[PDB]
């Protein structure tokens, strides 16, 4: 409505509302006047437009992110503080008080620990920077400077580099997170909740979950190592101790891992310019087990087809081969597909 | 106490020494729970207190975190309330 | 017949008045098209604007009716979050628009939705029962039991 | 590269050469049937003496605080007299002096004087010249 | 800026903007043309100010925060009366039933059961308040 | 049919010298509904199709059977 209403044509109704006979056109004192007011009136309904805009945020860092935010839930971080330690080589019963200040040129630090020259304990206390940012994040071999003066000291040091400074959460960074948990669906006990449970833990790259696989209060976790490999005994046992930890008090986790089906793949193909054979057997590998985790049934040898040429890389492609055929491999139960070898002549 | 404090929006010095220069002054006798107490001169370990003559803390390298009775704690030096 | 009082006694000749009814109609129509505006913020009064909300909820979808928008819009920023008993009842009460009573067992690990579905199209119950589906917990069996 | 150490920017500083007042010119203006004029199918614009008789009589025309649209400054207080508010010698001069106030605000209009004042039964009758630049 | 942009600023934008050769002032046919919309937009300007603060759910006034939590599905919680027991004295058998209403200054309460005056179920019966608000917590 | 000819279209469009035969099965296999094809023939041939100056292809007749 707002963008309907144009200069042009609340020009045209104005000058058409007007029942009289005198004339209007270009050069006349009627249309000058009428211009010259409708340009300020059509201002407003472009303020109006960007109001619009502004209030659903969806450019342009409108400062009403916020505030939807907090609407939502999310908060931005502030940053953690670099932390570190330092070493005191000064005179022996010297002892540094915790809390004593320090500096780094622009930059300040505090003491956290007791430390006294010469001890038994060692001359190295932990530090930590007054103030958040990536710029605390020091390197190895730094002198500090004392902002108080304490008697016995005489160089301070640290042995290698501060670690864990970061900066402030940028608003776009904010606006990306807040897309990609809208985009998640995180529910009290839900097969998604499952899923995220499963994919935190570490040797897990693919989930699969299953309710009711052995009645009610059972849920049966299906997990797949990397290029859809089988997930080993020990990764299995922490990715289930970490559901158990995570699962509701009353349902019982059974996990189990695939079986691999050994499949060689050959093809003769002509690269784009700027694109090498490993870059494409990369991103063929990825295509591939993208394809292998999704499919039921029998592997297609037109649909690998398709997939090898739509890698980005790949200009052309022929004498395609699947097992030494351009035939359908049937997949049985408890068998996945598992790229083995990839022969690829340009 | 860093971590419990800031879990309900109270902000201490990371270290205990000035964490002692923070907040009412406590005595011995008006402790009560969530009080934190301090000993030594240097308060190489803060206590978090919790009322019935115990506390808890972190002892120090090789000990965990446990319950510990204040009386055997003869070294009070002074106590502060933040909440 | 607003505008033109602004002006002295002399100013009430056909020209002038006619010059004066033209701007009336257009302040007219700019205070109509304010009110619009403002009324498309909400959710339940927008209708142009309820696209606008998709592209904040990821909704990603086309639907014909605009009752059907609205539903999908209070379902997604209702199920976030917590989800309780009473909150999924309250979210199946507001895509059925009828109350809805929640009964669990919890020796067979399945509870059942009692509710009203004179009003609530089975297609869209069914709809329902896939979200809640995806909110439930997995373990967990669940049954629709609609009374009309 | 040089500092510009005054505020603002050189734009600012550029005076534009001063001249004399622009020809006045107004839409006319028809007293006996209080309506503007149409001339060939469009506004007749008249200049200079004219245009003057129309500033003044609509200025003449108006009360002072009426209307919103208008300053504290434009108008005219003649309504106050009306019905015999002050006694005569007081309304003639008032009279007088509202005259001159009215009329002196316009830059074209050099000096106003009211002259002769008569009471003739329910009637007050006054002279006025004015003194522009033309 | 909406503040900065006031009636005299809008007025005089708007003649800047209008090419004519005759003479723009107070007291013209082009300023008095003009002038009166011009007025209009400027009051404008203030809604439109006030409307985004209405928008929000920080500040959102009575019945559009009701409408926003109401989406998020949160409903305004409404007190309850008070529940209290009064003892009737007076002569034996006198009845009083359901219904009957009891006042202490000017606050208004209801007798829930039927209690007889002197009987043996005692002459001590419920009292609900007519009327919800902590005001109706009498005393002993 | 239509989404191929949508695909097939873009691809005309960004396509410089001589057709892509393994691009346009690509294209047919990726739109959405076809499970497996064969047989693919381009103006009655498997060969790339060069595109002489000041000539764009357009799509004909297209002959699928199920």
Known sequence: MYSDQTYEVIKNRTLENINLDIYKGEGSFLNNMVSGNNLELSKIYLELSKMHKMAFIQDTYNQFLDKRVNEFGVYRKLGTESNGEVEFIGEKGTVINNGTIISYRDLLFVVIKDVTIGSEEGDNSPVQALEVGKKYNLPTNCEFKLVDNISGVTKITNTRSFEGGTDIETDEELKERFYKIQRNQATSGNKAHYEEWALEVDGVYNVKVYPRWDGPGTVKVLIFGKNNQAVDTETIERCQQHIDEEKPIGPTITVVTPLPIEISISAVMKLEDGYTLDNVKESFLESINTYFRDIRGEIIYTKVMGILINTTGVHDLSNLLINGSTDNITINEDKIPSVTTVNFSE | ?83 | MKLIDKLPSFDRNYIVEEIQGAYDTELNILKEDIDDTFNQLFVDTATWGLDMWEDILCIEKKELDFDTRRSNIKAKMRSRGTSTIEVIKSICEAYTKSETDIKVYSDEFTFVLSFIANNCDYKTLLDCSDMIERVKPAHLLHYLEPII | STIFPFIGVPEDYILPKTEELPIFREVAWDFEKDEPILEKGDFKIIEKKEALKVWIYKCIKTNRYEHEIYSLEYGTELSELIGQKYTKGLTESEASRFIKEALLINPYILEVNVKSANFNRDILSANVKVSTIY
């Open chain 2, 1 to 83: 106490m860093v971590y419990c404090f800031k879990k309900v929006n109270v902000s201490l010095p990371r270290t205990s020494n000035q964490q002692s220069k923070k907040g009412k002054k406590v005595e011995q006798k008006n402790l009560q729970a969530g009080d934190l107490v301090f000993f030594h001169n240097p308060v190489s370990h803060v206590g978090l207190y919790i009322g019935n003559g115990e506390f808890l803390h972190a002892p120090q390298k090789g000990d965990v975190v446990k319950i510990s009775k204040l009386s055997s704690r003869r070294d009070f030096n002074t106590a502060r309330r933040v909440l």
